[PDB]
Amino acid sequence: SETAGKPIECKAAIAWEAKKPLEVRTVTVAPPGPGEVRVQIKATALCQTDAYTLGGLDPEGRFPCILGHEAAGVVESVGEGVTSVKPGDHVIPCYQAYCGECKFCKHPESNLCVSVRAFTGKGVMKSDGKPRFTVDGKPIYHFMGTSTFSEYTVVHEQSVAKIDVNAPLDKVCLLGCGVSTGWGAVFNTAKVTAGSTVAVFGLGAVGLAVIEAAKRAGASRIIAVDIDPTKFPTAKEFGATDCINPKDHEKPIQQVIVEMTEWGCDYTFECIGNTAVMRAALECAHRGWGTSVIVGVAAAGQEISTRPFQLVTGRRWMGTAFGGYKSRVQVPDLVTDYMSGATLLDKYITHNMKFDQINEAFELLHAGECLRCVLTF
Amino acid sequence: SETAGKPIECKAAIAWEAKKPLEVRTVTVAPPGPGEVRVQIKATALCQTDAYTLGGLDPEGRFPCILGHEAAGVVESVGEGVTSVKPGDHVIPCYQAYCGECKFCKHPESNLCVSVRAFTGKGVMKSDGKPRFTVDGKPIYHFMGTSTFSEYTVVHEQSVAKIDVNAPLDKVCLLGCGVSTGWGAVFNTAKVTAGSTVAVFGLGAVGLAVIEAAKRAGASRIIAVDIDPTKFPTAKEFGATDCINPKDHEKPIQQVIVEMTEWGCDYTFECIGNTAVMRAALECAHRGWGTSVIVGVAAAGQEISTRPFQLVTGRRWMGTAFGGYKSRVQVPDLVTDYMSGATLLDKYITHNMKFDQINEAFELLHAGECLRCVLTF
Ligand SMILES: [Cl-]
Ligand SMILES: [Zn+2]
Ligand SMILES: [Zn+2]
Ligand SMILES: [Zn+2]
Ligand SMILES: [Zn+2]
Numbered sequence: 001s002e003t004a005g006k007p008i009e010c011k012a013a014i015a016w017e018a019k020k021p022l023e024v025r026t027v028t029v030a031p032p033g034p035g036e037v038r039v040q041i042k043a044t045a046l047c048q049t050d051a052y053t054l055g056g057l058d059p060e061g062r063f064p065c066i067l068g069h070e071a072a073g074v075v076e077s078v079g080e081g082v083t084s085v086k087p088g089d090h091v092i093p094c095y096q097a098y099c100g101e102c103k104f105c106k107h108p109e110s111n112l113c114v115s116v117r118a119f120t121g122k123g124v125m126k127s128d129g130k131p132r133f134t135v136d137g138k139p140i141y142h143f144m145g146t147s148t149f150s151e152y153t154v155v156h157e158q159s160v161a162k163i164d165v166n167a168p169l170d171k172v173c174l175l176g177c178g179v180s181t182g183w184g185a186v187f188n189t190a191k192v193t194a195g196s197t198v199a200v201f202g203l204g205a206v207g208l209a210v211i212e213a214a215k216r217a218g219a220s221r222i223i224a225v226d227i228d229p230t231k232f233p234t235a236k237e238f239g240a241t242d243c244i245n246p247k248d249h250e251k252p253i254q255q256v257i258v259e260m261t262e263w264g265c266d267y268t269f270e271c272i273g274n275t276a277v278m279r280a281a282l283e284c285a286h287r288g289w290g291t292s293v294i295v296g297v298a299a300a301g302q303e304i305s306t307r308p309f310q311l312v313t314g315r316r317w318m319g320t321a322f323g324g325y326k327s328r329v330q331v332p333d334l335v336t337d338y339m340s341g342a343t344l345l346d347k348y349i350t351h352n353m354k355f356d357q358i359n360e361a362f363e364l365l366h367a368g369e370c371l372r373c374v375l376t377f
Numbered sequence: 378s379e380t381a382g383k384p385i386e387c388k389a390a391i392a393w394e395a396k397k398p399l400e401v402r403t404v405t406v407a408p409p410g411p412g413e414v415r416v417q418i419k420a421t422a423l424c425q426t427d428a429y430t431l432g433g434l435d436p437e438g439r440f441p442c443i444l445g446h447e448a449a450g451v452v453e454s455v456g457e458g459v460t461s462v463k464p465g466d467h468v469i470p471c472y473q474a475y476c477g478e479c480k481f482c483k484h485p486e487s488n489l490c491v492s493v494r495a496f497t498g499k500g501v502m503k504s505d506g507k508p509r510f511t512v513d514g515k516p517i518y519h520f521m522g523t524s525t526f527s528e529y530t531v532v533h534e535q536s537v538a539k540i541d542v543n544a545p546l547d548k549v550c551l552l553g554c555g556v557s558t559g560w561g562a563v564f565n566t567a568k569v570t571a572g573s574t575v576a577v578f579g580l581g582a583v584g585l586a587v588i589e590a591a592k593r594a595g596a597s598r599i600i601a602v603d604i605d606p607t608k609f610p611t612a613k614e615f616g617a618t619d620c621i622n623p624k625d626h627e628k629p630i631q632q633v634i635v636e637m638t639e640w641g642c643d644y645t646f647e648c649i650g651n652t653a654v655m656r657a658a659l660e661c662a663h664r665g666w667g668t669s670v671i672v673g674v675a676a677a678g679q680e681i682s683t684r685p686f687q688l689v690t691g692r693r694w695m696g697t698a699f700g701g702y703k704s705r706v707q708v709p710d711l712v713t714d715y716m717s718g719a720t721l722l723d724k725y726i727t728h729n730m731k732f733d734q735i736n737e738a739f740e741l742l743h744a745g746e747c748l749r750c751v752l753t754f
Contacts, residue, residue, distance in 0.1 A: 110665030288487030311696030319688030
C-alpha cells in the first residue's frame with residue numbers, strides 16, 4: 001500500500017476549544033500501533049452528543065480534539081496483531097467497544113465493555129497512552145474512541161464493526177449511534193411487546209427511531225411528544241398515532257399523557273437529554289407496570305428526581321447506551337436488516353453535504369432543521 | 378348461627394385520636410352488606426404501618442378508627458351475593474384487594490387492584506360508603522380495608538383470601554403484609570437469579586424476609602446493611618453472608634458496597650423507607666444490569682434522586698407493593714408454601730401477647746424490641 005506504515009496528512013475538523021466553531025484544516029494521522037486500525041471515513045453524520053461536547057457540557061471534554069462518532073468507512077491498514085479485519089474491509093467505528101471476554105461483554109443484558117473505556121474516555125490510545133493526531137507536532141485528542149470528523153482516523157480493534165461490504169456507506173453510517181440507540185431502546189432495553197402503548201419524548205432522529213421500532217414491535221398506540229410541531233408529519237410517517245405539543249396544554253405533560261391513556265403508557269422513552277422531561281416520561285409510564293427508558297444525554301451533574309411512590313406503585317426507570325447493542329457482534333446484524341429492506345433508515349437523512357460545510361451542519365442541528373446530515377469528503 | 382344477620386358486640390381497640398393510647402372496649406359490628414364478609418379474628422399482629430397512622434403522620438388518617446391489618450381468622454357470615462367464601466372458612470383479610478376483573482388484576486406484573494381502594498382509603502365500605510363499626514351509635518372508621526384490632530370485622534369480599542384450614546392462624550397472620558412483601562420483592566419484582574449477589578438495606582421483618590428469599594433463590598452473597606449492628610446476628614440467621622454498618626466507614630455506603638463487589642450487587646433492596654438510602658441502594662446496584670427495588674414507604678415530602686448516568690449505564694430502579702402478590706390468588710399459595718416446611722415464617726414471631734396488652738405491644742414495637750408481636754383474644 002502507498003500509505004501503510006506512514007503518517008497521513010488529511011482533512012479534518014478540529015475543536016481547538018469549547019463553544020467555538022470547528023476549524024476544517026489539515027491534520028497528521030499516525031500509523032496504527034498494536035491492536036489498532038486506521039480507517040478511511042467515507043461518510044459521517046452529526047449527533048447531538050457531538051454538539052453537547054462542543055458546547056462545553058462534557059465533564060471529560062478534552063481539547064483540542066476531533067469530534068464525530070457516527071461514520072462508516074474502509075480499513076486502510078491495521079497494526080500489529082490485528083486479525084478481525086484487514087485492508088479493504090468495510091467497517092463502522094463503534095464508540096461502545098466489544099471484546100467478548102469481560103464481564104459486560106459476556107452478560108446477555110449489557111453492552112458496556114471495559115476493554116478500552118479507560119483510554120477512549122481520555123481521548124488517547126491504550127497501547128501507549130497517546131493520541132494519533134498531530135498539528136505541527138502537537139497532540140490532538142480523540143473523541144469517544146472514534147473521532148470520525150477526519151478523512152482518516154485510528155481506533156482500537158475492539159471498536160471496529162466489520163459490515164456487509166455491499167452496504168452503502170453514506171446510509172449505514174447512521175447505525176454508528178443515533179438510529180441504533182433508538183431501535184435498541186425498544187428491542188433490547190424496554191423489549192416492547194405486541195399490542196402495547198408507547199410515548200416518545202423528542203422527535204429528532206433518536207425519537208423517530210424509537211417510533212419506527214415500536215411500530216415494528218407491534219405497538220398499538222404511539223404518542224409522539226415535542227414542543228416543535230413541525231416534527232409531527234414525519235413522526236406520523238414513521239408510525240405515530242398521536243402527536244402532542246406540551247405548549248398546547250396547561251397541565252404538566254405527564255398529566256396530559258396519563259389523561260389520554262387513563263393510567264399512562266406501557267412504555268415511555270426520553271430522547272432529549274432534559275432531566276425535567278425524564279421525570280415527566282417516568283410519571284406517565286403506566287401505573288403498575290410501566291417502563292420508562294432514558295435514551296438522551298443530560299448535562300453532567302444534573303439530577304433526575306421523582307417520588308418513590310411512583311416506583312412502589314409499579315413503574316420502572318431505566319436507561320440505555322447505544323441501544324444495548326453489543327457493537328461488533330450486532331452492528332453487522334443491523335446492516336443485514338437494512339440490506340433486507342426491512343427498515344426506514346434511508347428516511348432519516350435530510351441533508352447530504354460536503355465535509356467543508358460541517359459548521360453549517362451544526363447550525364442545522366441546533367435549529368432542529370434536520371434529522372441527520374451526512375457529510376462526505 | 379346465633380349471630381348471622383345481627384349486630385355483634387365484641388372487644389376491640391379504638392384509636393379515638395392520634396398520639397393517644399388505644400382504648401380496649403366493646404364495639405358494635407354491623408352485619409355484612411352486599412359483597413361483604415364478617416370475619417372472626419383469631420390472631421392479629423402489629424406493624425410499623427399501624428403505628429405510623431396512630432402517631433398522626435398519615436395524610437389519610439381518619440379518627441376515630443380501628444387499626445390493624447395483619448390477621449387471620451374464620452368467616453362468621455357473608456353478605457348478599459358472596460359465594461367465594463362461606464361461614465367456617467379460614468381466611469386472611471388483605472389490605473391489597475384482588476377482583477380479577479380490573480386492568481391491574483388482569484396484568485401479569487401488577488397486583489394493584491382498584492376495585493375497593495377508594496373506599497378503604499377513606500375507612501368505609503364500597504356498598505354504601507359507610508363504616509360498619511359504632512360506639513353508642515357513633516361511627517368508627519375502618520383502616521386499610523381490614524381493621525383487624527377487633528374480635529369481629531367486616532371486609533370487602535375482594536380482600537378475603539381463603540386459606541388451608543390446617544394452617545395455624547397465629548403464624549400465617551403475617552402473610553398479609555411485611556413478610557410477604559419482602560419475599561415478593563425477591564421472587565416477583567426483582568426475580569433474583571441463582572448465583573447472584575444481593576444487598577439489603579434495613580433489617581426489620583421486611584429486610585429479613587428479603588434476605589430469607591434471596592437465600593432461597595440461590596444468591597451467592599447477601600450483604601445486610603444497617604446502622605444498628607445488634608440486628609446483625611439475626612440477619613445472619615436468616616441467611617446474610619456479610620453485615621455492614623455504614624457508620625463504620627468514612628466513604629458513602631454505596632462506594633463501600635461497590636468496592637466489596639467490584640461493580641455493585643446484581644440486586645439491591647431498600648427496606649426502611651429512607652430516600653437517601655434508596656439512592657444509595659440504586660448506586661451500588663451492578664453496573665450494566667443491576668436492579669434496585671424500593672420496598673419501604675418514604676415520608677410525606679421526600680423525593681428520590683440520582684444522576685441519569687446511573688440508569689444509562691445499566692441500573693434499573695423499581696419498587697414493590699405487597700411483594701407483587703395478587704392477594705386472593707397467591708396468599709393461599711404462600712400458606713401452602715409455609716405448610717410445606719420451606720420457610721422461616723415462624724422465626725418472625727418474637728412475642729405472643731393477649732389483646733388486652735395491645736398498648737404494651739405498641740411500646741415494644743416503638744422500642745425496637747421485637748420483629749413481630751402476635752395478639753390473641
Ligand atoms: Cl358501585
Ligand atoms: Zn451519538
Ligand atoms: Zn468487553
Ligand atoms: Zn404490616
Ligand atoms: Zn382488580
